[PDB]
Design an enzyme around this catalytic site. Structure first.
Site, PDB file in Angstrom:
ATOM      1  N   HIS A  92     -30.769  60.443 -29.439  1.00  0.00           N
ATOM      2  CA  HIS A  92     -30.384  59.019 -29.288  1.00  0.00           C
ATOM      3  C   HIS A  92     -29.687  58.499 -30.553  1.00  0.00           C
ATOM      4  CE1 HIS A  92     -32.948  59.014 -25.651  1.00  0.00           C
ATOM      5  NE2 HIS A  92     -31.848  58.356 -25.254  1.00  0.00           N
ATOM      6  N   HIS A 104     -24.347  60.476 -29.651  1.00  0.00           N
ATOM      7  CA  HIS A 104     -24.583  60.088 -28.237  1.00  0.00           C
ATOM      8  C   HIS A 104     -23.761  58.837 -27.949  1.00  0.00           C
ATOM      9  CE1 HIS A 104     -26.656  59.039 -24.495  1.00  0.00           C
ATOM     10  NE2 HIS A 104     -27.061  57.899 -25.045  1.00  0.00           N
ATOM     11  N   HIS A 135     -24.953  50.876 -26.963  1.00  0.00           N
ATOM     12  CA  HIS A 135     -25.963  50.810 -25.880  1.00  0.00           C
ATOM     13  C   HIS A 135     -27.323  51.328 -26.357  1.00  0.00           C
ATOM     14  CE1 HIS A 135     -25.532  55.086 -25.099  1.00  0.00           C
ATOM     15  NE2 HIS A 135     -26.604  54.992 -24.331  1.00  0.00           N
ATOM     16  N   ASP A 136     -27.405  52.168 -27.396  1.00  0.00           N
ATOM     17  CA  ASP A 136     -28.705  52.693 -27.913  1.00  0.00           C
ATOM     18  C   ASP A 136     -28.896  52.350 -29.407  1.00  0.00           C
ATOM     19  OD1 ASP A 136     -30.246  53.811 -25.738  1.00  0.00           O
ATOM     20  OD2 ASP A 136     -28.955  55.578 -25.690  1.00  0.00           O
ATOM     21  N   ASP A 179     -24.032  57.337 -19.554  1.00  0.00           N
ATOM     22  CA  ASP A 179     -25.251  57.536 -20.363  1.00  0.00           C
ATOM     23  C   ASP A 179     -25.842  58.915 -20.098  1.00  0.00           C
ATOM     24  OD1 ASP A 179     -27.117  56.944 -22.276  1.00  0.00           O
ATOM     25  OD2 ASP A 179     -28.548  56.102 -20.778  1.00  0.00           O
ATOM     26  N   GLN A 182     -35.740  70.279 -15.208  1.00  0.00           N
ATOM     27  CA  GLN A 182     -34.287  69.980 -15.178  1.00  0.00           C
ATOM     28  C   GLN A 182     -33.804  69.930 -13.725  1.00  0.00           C
ATOM     29  OE1 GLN A 182     -31.977  68.810 -17.649  1.00  0.00           O
ATOM     30  NE2 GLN A 182     -34.089  68.374 -18.204  1.00  0.00           N
TER      31      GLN A 182
HETATM   32  C1  LIG Z   1     -34.632  60.144 -18.810  1.00  0.00           C
HETATM   33  N1  LIG Z   1     -33.517  61.063 -19.046  1.00  0.00           N
HETATM   34  N2  LIG Z   1     -32.298  60.834 -19.649  1.00  0.00           N
HETATM   35  C2  LIG Z   1     -31.647  62.040 -19.765  1.00  0.00           C
HETATM   36  C3  LIG Z   1     -32.503  63.071 -19.190  1.00  0.00           C
HETATM   37  C4  LIG Z   1     -32.254  64.508 -19.181  1.00  0.00           C
HETATM   38  O1  LIG Z   1     -33.233  65.396 -19.089  1.00  0.00           O
HETATM   39  N3  LIG Z   1     -30.867  64.784 -19.269  1.00  0.00           N
HETATM   40  C5  LIG Z   1     -30.440  66.179 -19.255  1.00  0.00           C
HETATM   41  C6  LIG Z   1     -29.843  66.667 -20.577  1.00  0.00           C
HETATM   42  C7  LIG Z   1     -29.889  65.732 -21.658  1.00  0.00           C
HETATM   43  C8  LIG Z   1     -29.389  66.137 -22.874  1.00  0.00           C
HETATM   44  C9  LIG Z   1     -28.827  67.419 -22.962  1.00  0.00           C
HETATM   45  C10 LIG Z   1     -28.791  68.300 -21.853  1.00  0.00           C
HETATM   46  N4  LIG Z   1     -29.295  67.929 -20.668  1.00  0.00           N
HETATM   47  C11 LIG Z   1     -33.647  62.406 -18.674  1.00  0.00           C
HETATM   48  C12 LIG Z   1     -34.857  62.893 -17.912  1.00  0.00           C
HETATM   49  O2  LIG Z   1     -35.783  62.144 -17.546  1.00  0.00           O
HETATM   50  N5  LIG Z   1     -34.934  64.247 -17.701  1.00  0.00           N
HETATM   51  C13 LIG Z   1     -36.088  64.902 -17.204  1.00  0.00           C
HETATM   52  C14 LIG Z   1     -36.796  64.285 -16.056  1.00  0.00           C
HETATM   53  C15 LIG Z   1     -37.936  64.841 -15.560  1.00  0.00           C
HETATM   54  N6  LIG Z   1     -38.372  65.994 -16.102  1.00  0.00           N
HETATM   55  C16 LIG Z   1     -39.494  66.822 -15.875  1.00  0.00           C
HETATM   56  C17 LIG Z   1     -39.406  67.834 -16.882  1.00  0.00           C
HETATM   57  C18 LIG Z   1     -40.348  68.874 -17.199  1.00  0.00           C
HETATM   58  C19 LIG Z   1     -40.113  69.708 -18.302  1.00  0.00           C
HETATM   59  C20 LIG Z   1     -41.019  70.716 -18.587  1.00  0.00           C
HETATM   60  C21 LIG Z   1     -42.147  70.908 -17.761  1.00  0.00           C
HETATM   61  C22 LIG Z   1     -42.349  70.115 -16.631  1.00  0.00           C
HETATM   62  C23 LIG Z   1     -41.439  69.107 -16.354  1.00  0.00           C
HETATM   63  N7  LIG Z   1     -38.175  67.783 -17.583  1.00  0.00           N
HETATM   64  C24 LIG Z   1     -37.580  66.605 -17.193  1.00  0.00           C
HETATM   65  N8  LIG Z   1     -36.448  66.046 -17.766  1.00  0.00           N
HETATM   66 MG   LIG Z   2     -30.924  53.901 -23.992  1.00  0.00          MG
HETATM   67 ZN   LIG Z   3     -28.141  56.357 -24.061  1.00  0.00          ZN
END
Ligand SMILES: Cn1ncc(C(=O)NCc2ccccn2)c1C(=O)Nc1ccn2cc(-c3ccccc3)nc2n1
Ligand SMILES: [Mg+2]
Ligand SMILES: [Zn+2]
Length: 313
Positions: A68, A72, A106-107, A217, A269
């Site tokens: 963040h 970003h 935004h952040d 975002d 993911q």
């Molecule tokens: C909020 N928000 N904003 C961005 C992202 C994100 O993950 N974006 C994807 C990206 C972000 C940055 C770089 C590459 N990819 C999210 C989010 O809630 N993701 C999530 C959502 C739900 N989960 C569940 C798990 C998980 C991991 C391990 C074991 C069990 C469960 N893991 C989860 N992850």
């Molecule tokens: Mg934010």
């Molecule tokens: Zn953001």
């Protein structure tokens, strides 16, 4: 007045593409942002002395957190730049000005913790803002920096154009609260299918701009696989740190944030791509056809996560 920013040839071309990566050289990001404002808005939209001083104040007020951060901020503004350039005529002069700034801000002053962690901690910001806690904080910090002597990039606007732009930026930034995304896209879903979607309806634009903001975002999921794969480390470092802190309060965190459950990341993911990212870029592609590359890039990455699960990496 006659002082364009010019990027090297590879950036000049690649920046125009949705999947563009801004690279590891911090010192070029401000010039990248100005380059985008100039092509998206004009060389006239903002006095360069003031714009430059606003950008460096925003940079200063992002923290050194794994995800963040200032990188970003500019990544999210570029995605918005890609959307505006591929939908030239759909957006006002004011909207192009206000949305690139909204994305950059935004952040602002994010600490690498969710609204939930602020609330379980009983952080002052949770008393001052009951819902969309960090997002109201981020809008507050944007206004703070706009009011510094020399930092009002909007000062050349008429009183009402200024109120219109601060109102766009506020809605824009609140919309990045993912808890509000789900209902925003359900309504946009119904409005597009039933055929009542009307872009001259200001309450409908608001919704559309909100989904654009969710799409920018989350645009980590729309990069080429190696960017997405290595980025994902950064977001999990915040998530796990928050899990650590939840445990310190005596609360078992959700698995997303439990570093003991790293193993289940590819499955987590998957859920996210299916529950959030694909629906987001699907509905965005329906409303704004030229944003299709974000949906396609997202599907490629969903597929890359399925490959990880199957042991093929
Ligand atoms: C909020 N928000 N904003 C961005 C992202 C994100 O993950 N974006 C994807 C990206 C972000 C940055 C770089 C590459 N990819 C999210 C989010 O809630 N993701 C999530 C959502 C739900 N989960 C569940 C798990 C998980 C991991 C391990 C074991 C069990 C469960 N893991 C989860 N992850
Ligand atoms: Mg934010
Ligand atoms: Zn953001």
């Amino acid at each position: 007045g006659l002082m364009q920013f010019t990027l090297p040839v590879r950036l000049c071309k690649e920046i125009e593409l949705f999947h563009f990566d801004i690279g590891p050289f911090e010192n070029m990001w401000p010039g990248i942002f100005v380059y985008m404002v100039h092509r998206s808005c004009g060389t006239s939209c903002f006095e360069l002395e003031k714009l430059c001083r606003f950008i460096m104040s925003v940079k200063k007020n992002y923290r050194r957190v794994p995800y963040h951060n200032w990188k970003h901020a500019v990544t999210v503004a570029h995605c918005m730049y890609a959307i505006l350039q591929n939908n030239h005529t759909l957006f006002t002069d004011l909207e192009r000005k206000g949305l690139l700034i909204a994305c950059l801000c935004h952040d602002l002053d994010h600490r690498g913790f969710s609204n939930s962690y602020l609330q379980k901690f009983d952080h002052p910001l949770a008393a001052l803002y009951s819902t969309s806690t960090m997002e109201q904080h981020h809008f507050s910090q944007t206004v703070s920096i706009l009011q510094l002597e020399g930092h009002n990039i909007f000062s050349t606007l008429s009183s009402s154009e200024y109120e219109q732009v601060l109102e766009i930026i506020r809605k824009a930034i609140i919309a990045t609260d993912l808890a509000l995304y789900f209902g925003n896209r359900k309504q946009l879903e119904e409005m597009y299918q039933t055929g009542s979607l009307n872009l001259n309806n200001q309450s409908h634009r608001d919704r559309v701009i909100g989904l654009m903001m969710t799409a920018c975002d989350l645009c980590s999921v729309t990069k080429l696989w190696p960017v997405t794969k290595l980025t994902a480390n950064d977001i999990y470092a915040e998530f796990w740190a928050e899990g650590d802190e939840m445990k310190k309060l005596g609360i078992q965190p959700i698995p997303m944030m439990d570093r003991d459950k790293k193993d289940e990341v590819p499955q987590g993911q998957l859920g996210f791509y299916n529950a959030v990212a694909i629906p987001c870029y699907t509905t965005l592609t329906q409303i704004l056809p030229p944003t299709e590359p974000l949906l396609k890039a997202c599907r490629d990455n969903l597929s890359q996560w399925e490959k990880v699960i199957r042991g093929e990496e």
